[PDB]
Design a protein around this motif. Structure first.
Motif, PDB file in Angstrom:
ATOM      1  N   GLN A 147       0.817  -1.201   0.000  1.00  0.00           N
ATOM      2  CA  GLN A 147       0.000   0.000   0.000  1.00  0.00           C
ATOM      3  C   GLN A 147       0.859   1.262   0.000  1.00  0.00           C
ATOM      4  O   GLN A 147       2.042   1.244   0.350  1.00  0.00           O
ATOM      5  CB  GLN A 147      -0.935  -0.021   1.205  1.00  0.00           C
ATOM      6  CG  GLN A 147      -0.455   0.795   2.376  1.00  0.00           C
ATOM      7  CD  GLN A 147      -1.486   0.854   3.472  1.00  0.00           C
ATOM      8  OE1 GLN A 147      -2.660   1.111   3.218  1.00  0.00           O
ATOM      9  NE2 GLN A 147      -1.060   0.580   4.697  1.00  0.00           N
ATOM     10  N   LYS A 159      -6.771   6.934   5.271  1.00  0.00           N
ATOM     11  CA  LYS A 159      -7.313   6.205   4.136  1.00  0.00           C
ATOM     12  C   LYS A 159      -7.966   4.920   4.621  1.00  0.00           C
ATOM     13  O   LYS A 159      -7.428   4.234   5.494  1.00  0.00           O
ATOM     14  CB  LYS A 159      -6.219   5.885   3.109  1.00  0.00           C
ATOM     15  CG  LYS A 159      -6.658   4.965   1.982  1.00  0.00           C
ATOM     16  CD  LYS A 159      -5.637   4.946   0.856  1.00  0.00           C
ATOM     17  CE  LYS A 159      -6.105   4.080  -0.302  1.00  0.00           C
ATOM     18  NZ  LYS A 159      -5.000   3.783  -1.255  1.00  0.00           N
ATOM     19  N   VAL A 203      -8.702   1.216   3.870  1.00  0.00           N
ATOM     20  CA  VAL A 203      -8.026   0.197   3.076  1.00  0.00           C
ATOM     21  C   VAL A 203      -8.947  -1.004   2.937  1.00  0.00           C
ATOM     22  O   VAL A 203      -9.332  -1.621   3.938  1.00  0.00           O
ATOM     23  CB  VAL A 203      -6.686  -0.204   3.717  1.00  0.00           C
ATOM     24  CG1 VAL A 203      -6.007  -1.286   2.896  1.00  0.00           C
ATOM     25  CG2 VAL A 203      -5.789   1.012   3.862  1.00  0.00           C
ATOM     26  N   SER A 227     -12.205  -3.912   5.942  1.00  0.00           N
ATOM     27  CA  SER A 227     -11.764  -2.534   5.781  1.00  0.00           C
ATOM     28  C   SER A 227     -10.853  -2.153   6.940  1.00  0.00           C
ATOM     29  O   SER A 227     -11.193  -2.383   8.105  1.00  0.00           O
ATOM     30  CB  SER A 227     -12.956  -1.580   5.709  1.00  0.00           C
ATOM     31  OG  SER A 227     -12.610  -0.306   6.220  1.00  0.00           O
TER      32      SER A 227
END
Lengths: 346, 346, 346, 346, 346
Positions: free
Chosen positions: A309, A316, A318, A328
RNA sequence: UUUUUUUUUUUUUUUUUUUUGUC
RNA sequence: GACAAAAAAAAAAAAAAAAAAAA
C-alpha cells in the motif's frame, strides 16, 4: 424420533440412522438418558431452539471436515443441503433452518423446492448427487476436494473445521475448491487472503517469519525483515505503557505477549468471524482496551498487505478481501511512515 | 417415542397405539406441536416428572371408567398393572411407577416379575388376562364388572371416575366388585360406607332426605326425621355466629350454605382423600376455620352412623369403615345428647 | 423498546407509540413492572417465542375488528403486513413472521420487498395505502369495509374478532370484502358457508330454526321442518345410549344437551379451525367418544347442506366449501335415508 | 431441614449434624445463601432430582475414601446404607434411593426392613455396627479396611475415591476387602484385574513397563518386552494414517500421544465405567473415530492378558473379569499373530 | 433500555451511553442478540436478580481499577454512588441496590437523598464531584488516587481489581487512599495488614523471603529466618501424614505444595473475603480437611504477626486487624512454643 | 452481667476396632 | 492368646473464644 436420536448418540456419539430407542428425560433444558437405572446427561441446550430440536440437530451435525463458519457466513450462505453445520463457537447450529434434517426446522425436503430457490444453499461435493443439485440450483455454494467439470475453481483455506477443532488435515483432505452461483450465474470468487484461525493458548507458527517474530525480540525482528516505518511496535507487538492499550491487532502479537505474561480475553460476541473483537486487559501492566479488533492473518500475508500500500496518505480506508469478504482497515500515516493499522469501526 | 405419542394425541386425543410422527417442541415444561406451520400447545406439565415422561404417561392414561384414586389409596394399591391411573385432582399420575407403559418409569414389563411381588398391584378385570394375573399375584386388587368364580365379591361405590369426571354410569358400567389379596391370601373386604364425591357448585341430591334438607329449612327437617339431640345445628348446618366457623363437616351442609351464600373453599391439599380439609371463609358473616374436615357421606349413611352411636359417653372415638378405610370421628356428648361430631385430627 | 412497550401497555393497554419508559423485570417467562415499589405482572408468555419478543408482539397486536384466525388460515395467509394478528385461542401470534413490527421476528420492513413476494400477505383495507400495496403484491389477501374500484368483492362472515371477542358488530363494522391474489392474478373466491364461531356456555341462536331447535323437543322439531330420514336424531341431537357416543357433530346439539345436563370438553388441539375435534365425555349417561368433530354451522345452512345431497348412495364423500376451505364429510345412507354425516378423518 | 443443611455446608463444608439455620434462597435450580447481605451460591443442581433434595444429598455425601462408583455398579450395589455415594463424574448421587438420609429419597430408616431385603445394600465396615448389619442382610456388599471373622476377604483396587479424587492412599487407607452376599449366601468374588482410573492430562506411570512405554520409542519398547505379533502397533499406540482412527484402546496410548500432540475427547456418556467410550478426534493428523472403547488397564496386566490368549483362532470373543465384572473383548488374528483386540460392541 | 444496552455491549464491549438498538431475545435466563440472522449469547444470568436487570447492571459495571470487593465489605460499604461494582467471584453485583444506574434497583438518583443517609455510600474520587459528595455524606467511603484537602488518607492494598483481574498496576494507579465517615464524622482507619489476593496457579512471590520459601527446603528456610518453635512445619508447610490435613493456612504453602503435587480446593463459599475456607483434598497422600481457613498474607507479614505474639499462653484468640477488619486467629502454644496458628473468620 | 445447648482447621487421655512386630 | 507400636472410630480433659435462648 427423540428416543432413536438418543440411542444413536449413546451408541456412536452422533446420529448414524440406526434403529433402537433408549429411555430419555428432558428437564431444565437438558437431555438425560438412563444407563443401568441412573440418569446420565447427554446434551445441554445452549441455543435458543427447543431442547429436543437442538438435541436432534446436534446429533445430526456434520462430523466430516467442513469449512469454518466464518467462511460460510462471508459467502452469504443461509442454509445447508441435507446437512447441519454446527457452530461450535456458539454451541448452536450455524443456520436457523435446515433442508431435510429436522422436521421442526425443515423448510423443505430437498434443496430443489421453490422455497430454497432465493436462499444460498451450501452444497458438499463429498456427498453424491450434490454437484448436480448445485448445477441446477439458482443460488448455492459448492465445495469439492477436487475439480468439477465446467466450473473454474477457487482454492479455499488450507484449514477446515473438524469436530469443533480446526486443523490442516494430513490423513484427511481439509482444502476445498469453492464455487458460487448467484441468480443462476456462476460467480468468479475473488483472490483473497485467509485467516489461520489459531488459538491464543495453542499458538503454533505456520511460517518462518512467525517463528522469527516469536523467538527474536522487537528490534531484531524489525531490522531483520526491513519492517522499519510500518509501526510494527504498536500494531503487532502492542503498547502497554498507557492506561488505554494501543494497537495489538494481530493474533500473533497477542500470543507473544501471552507467552511471557498471560492476560484475559473477554469475547463479548462469541461467534466465528474474520475479525474478532475482544475486551483486552493486561494482567501485568494494567493496560486495557474495551474493544480490540483482532485478526489472525499469516504474518507473511500481513507484511505483504502492509507493504503493498501507498504510505503517502494521511488517512485512508483500506479495502482488503480476507476470507472471501472485504475487510476494511484504517490507515494513519505521517512523514511517509505508518502510525496505526486496525480494522474499521472496531 | 415422544413424536408418536404426540401424533396419537393430536389424531385421537389419547394414545391409541397407531403409527405416525409429528414435529414436537418441548419448552418451559410444555409440549408443543406444529399444526399448519404454527406451534399448538398439547400438554402442560403440572407434575414433578420430566415433561416428556409426564406427557407420555398422560397420553397412555386410562379413559375407561376407573375407581376414584381415594379408593385405590385406601386399599393400599401402590402401582398398576399395564395401565396408568391419572389423578385429575393433582393433574399427576396416581402412582409413581407402572408396568410396561413408560420405559423410564417402568419397574417391570409384566406384573408377574419379582419386583412387583411386594407391591399391591392394581388389576382391572375388564382387560383380558388380568383376572388370571390377579390369581397368581402375591398382592393385588382386582375389580370386575361381573361375578368371579371362586371369589366372594365386595360391591364398591356406585360412582367411578370417567376421564376425570365422577359419574354414576348409565350407558357404561361404573359399579365394580373389589377383590384384595395380601401375601397370596384373599382378604374379605369389610362392609363399608362410600362417599358420594360430589362437587359444591354442582351438588345434586341423591336421596329423599337430601332433597328435604336442601329445600326445607332447619326446624322442619329436624322435626320430620327425628334428629333432635344429635347436634345437627353445628355438624351439618353449621354455626356462623362466632369468628371461628362451627362444624360444617358434611358437604351437604356446605352445599346448602353455598346455595344461599357462596363462600371460598381453599383446598391447601389438592388430592383425593376420603376426608378433605378446607380453609373455609364465609363471605357473608366473616366466620372462618383454618381446617374444616368435610366428608361427602350420603345423608342417610351419616344419619344411620350418628343414630347407631351410644350417647352415654362423654368422649369417644368412633372407628367406622368408610371408603375401605377406617375414619375415626370424635363424639362429644352431654346430658345424653350429641355436642359435636367431626373426623379426628382434622 | 421493551421498556417503552411496557410503558405503553401500562398507560394505554396496548402499544400506541408514545414515548416513556417504566422499570421492567423479566423472570420465569413473565414480564413484571414496578408500580409503587411492588412488581405487577404484565404478560405471561404462553408462546414458544422469547418472552420479550412475545410481549412486544402482544402489545402491538391489532385491537380493531379483524377476521377470525381460521378465515386467514383457510385463505392461505402466511404473514401480515405492518400488523399483528393475535390468536387468542392459542394466546400466541397467528403468524411466525411480521413486517415492520418486531425487529426479532421481522423479515422485511415493507411488504414490497422480494422476501415477501412468495408469501401470502394479509392487507387490511382500513389502513391508508394498504389497498395499493395489495394491488402491486404478487400474493396477498385484502379485506375492506367498502368496495374497491376494479375489484369484485367477496362478502365474508358477519362476525369478526375484537380483542378475542368474536361478535357481530353494531357500533363497529365487522363485515369485510375479501380479495385474494396469487402470482399476481386476482382469484374469484368461491361462495362459502360461514361458521358462526359461537361459545357453548354463551350460545345464542341466530335464526328461527335454531330457536325452535332449542325450545322444541326432538320429534316436534323433526316433524315441523320436515327432517325425516336425515338421521337428525343421532347426527345432530346425539346418541348417548351406548358407551361410545353417537353423532353430536353440530354445536347446536352440544348446546341443547349442555342446557339440560353439562359435560366435559377436552380440546386436545386448542387452536382455531373450521372443524373442531373434542374429547367429549357425558357426565350423565357415561357416553364418551375419544374424538368428535364439531362444526359451528348455522342450522339453516346445515339443513340446506343435508337436503342438497343425493341420498341414493351407500357411502359418499361430500366436498363442501365452508369458511373459504373445502370441508370434507362422510355421507352414509341406507334405504334412501341418511345414516351418518360427519366431517371425514375426524 | 434445608436451612440447617445449608448452615452445615457453610460452616463445615458438609453436613456434620450441627444445629443452626441460615437464610436460603432457591432459584433457577440453584441454592443461594445470604452472607453479609449478598446472595452467595452454594450448589447448582446438575441432577434430575429436585434442587433441595439434590442439595441435601450432596451435603450428606461420604467424605471418607470410598470405592469408585464403577466398582459398586459392577458388584450390583443398588443403594447404600446410612450414607450417600456421590458420583462426581455425573455430579449426581450414584444411587437413586437412600436409607435414613433424606426424607424424600428414603425407602426405609434402617437397612434391616423388608423393602431393602431384595436390594443389594452397600455396607461400610469403617462405620460401627455395619458388619453385623451386613451379616444379617439378605443381599449386601461390605467393604472393610481389615479382616472380618468367618468371612474370606477379597482384596480390592489399590485406589479409592476421596472427595472425587481417585488416589492410592498414603495417609489414608484406600485398599478395602470386599464381601458379597446374594440371597443370604456369601459369594466368593472372582479373581480380577483392576483399572487404575488415571486421567489423560494428569497421568503418571505406575510401573516400570509404563515408564519405558512413555520414555522409549515405538520399536525399542516393542522389541525389548517381546511384544511382536500382538498388534501393539494399532491396539496400543494407535494408527493415524487413515481418516478413521484405528485402535488406541488403552489409556497408555492416549497419554503417550497427548504428551506429544494434544487432541479432543468428547465424552458423550459422562459416567463412570470400567470401559469408557470417547469421540476421539486427532487435532494433528485429523484422524477421528466415532466410538473408541478406552480401558485404564495396567500395562503389565494387559500384556499378561494378551499373552494368555490363544493366537490360533480367526475370530474369538475373550471374557475377562475386570473390576468384578466380565469385560467382553473382540480378538482378531491372522497367521498366528494378533491383528485387532478391542472391547466388544464398542 | 434493554436493546440500547445490548447495542452498547456489542459495539463497545460495555455500556458507553451510545445511541442505537439491536434485536434482543431473552430466554432461559440468558440474553441473546441477533447478528447476521443467528442468535449470539451476550450474557448468562448467574445472579438472583432478573435477567434483564442483571444484564443491564453487568453492562454498566466499573471497567476502571476498583478496590477488591473484600476491602469494601470489610469497610461496611453498602452501596455505590453512580457506579456498579461487579463481584467477579460471585458473578454478581457487589451490592443489592444501586444509585442512578438501574430504575429496577435504584433507591435514589443521587447519594444526597434521605434514603441513602443511613447507608455507607462508596464514593470514587476519580469521578468529578464525588469527593464533594463524600464530604456532605453522613456515612460513606471515599477512595482517591491522591491527597484530599483537610482529610487524612488511609492507603489500602497495592493491588486493585481491573475487570476481574487483581493486579498491581504499572500503567494505571491501583493504590488508593481510603477515607471513611460514620454518622457525619470522619474516622481514622486502623493500621492493617493486606492480603495479596494471589492465585494458586499464577502465584508469584512479592518478597525475597517468599522466593527463598518457594526455592529452599523446609529445614533450610526455617533455620535461615530463625523460625524455630513457631510450628512453620505445619501451619504453613503442612503435615500430609495423617487422615486429617495439618495446617496449611497460608496460600504460599498451598502454592508450594501445588507446584510439586497438584490437589483440589473445593470452595464451598465462593465469594471474596480476607479468609477463605477450602475443602482441600491432597491428591498425592490422601490427607484431607473439611475446613481449611486460608489467608493470603504476605509471608513477612505473617512472620511478624506470629512473632509479635506472647508464647506463654495455653490458648488464646488474638485479634489481628487485616484488610481493614478484625480477623481472629487461634493461637495454640504449648510449653512456650506454637502448635498451630490459624485464622478462624469465615 | 448469669446460665443453657451447640461449635472451633491444637494437644493429652479413655475405649473399640484394625494393622503390624515379638513370644 | 498376650505383648509393643501404629491408624481409625467413639468418649473425657486441658485453654481462649463464637452463635442462639434465657437471665
Amino acid at each position: 424420533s427423540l428416543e432413536n436420536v438418543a440411542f444413536n448418540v449413546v451408541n456412536k456419539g452422533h446420529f448414524d440412522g440406526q434403529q433402537g430407542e433408549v429411555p430419555v428425560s428432558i428437564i431444565n433444558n437438558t437431555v438425560y438418558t438412563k444407563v443401568d437405572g441412573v440418569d446420565v446427561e447427554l446434551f445441554e441446550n445452549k441455543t435458543t431452539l427447543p431442547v429436543n430440536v437442538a438435541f436432534e440437530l446436534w446429533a445430526k451435525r456434520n462430523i466430516k471436515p467442513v469449512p469454518e463458519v466464518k467462511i460460510l457466513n462471508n459467502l452469504g450462505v443461509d442454509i445447508a443441503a441435507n446437512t447441519v453445520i454446527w457452530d461450535y463457537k456458539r454451541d448452536a447450529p450455524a443456520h436457523i433452518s435446515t433442508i431435510g434434517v429436522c422436521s421442526m426446522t425443515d423448510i423443505a425436503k430437498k434443496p430443489t423446492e421453490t422455497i430454497c430457490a432465493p436462499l444460498t444453499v451450501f452444497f458438499d461435493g463429498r456427498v453424491d448427487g450434490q454437484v448436480d443439485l448445485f448445477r441446477n440450483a439458482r443460488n448455492g455454494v459448492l465445495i469439492t476436494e477436487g475439480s468439477v467439470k465446467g466450473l473454474q475453481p477457487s482454492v479455499g483455506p488450507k484449514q477446515a473445521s473438524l469436530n469443533g477443532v480446526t486443523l490442516i488435515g494430513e490423513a484427511v483432505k481439509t482444502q476445498f475448491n469453492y464455487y458460487k452461483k448467484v441468480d443462476g450465474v456462476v460467480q468468479q470468487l475473488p483472490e483473497t487472503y485467509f485467516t489461520q484461525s489459531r488459538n491464543l493458548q495453542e499458538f503454533k507458527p505456520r511460517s518462518q517469519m512467525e517463528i522469527d517474530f516469536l523467538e527474536l525480540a522487537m528490534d531484531e525482528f524489525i531490522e531483520r525483515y526491513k519492517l522499519e516505518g510500518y509501526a510494527f511496535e504498536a500494531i503487532v507487538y502492542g503498547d502497554f505503557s498507557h492506561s488505554q492499550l494501543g494497537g495489538l491487532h494481530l493474533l500473533i502479537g497477542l500470543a507473544k505477549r501471552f507467552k511471557e505474561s498471560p492476560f484475559e480475553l473477554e469475547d463479548f460476541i462469541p461467534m466465528d468471524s474474520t475479525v474478532k473483537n475482544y475486551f483486552i486487559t493486561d494482567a501485568q501492566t494494567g493496560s486495557s482496551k474495551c474493544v480490540c479488533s483482532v485478526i489472525d492473518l499469516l504474518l507473511d500475508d500481513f507484511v505483504e498487505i502492509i507493504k503493498s500500500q501507498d504510505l503517502s496518505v494521511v488517512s485512508k480506508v483500506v479495502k482488503v478481501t480476507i476470507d472471501y469478504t472485504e475487510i476494511s482497515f484504517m490507515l494513519w500515516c505521517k512523514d511517509g511512515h505508518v502510525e496505526t493499522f486496525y480494522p474499521k469501526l472496531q
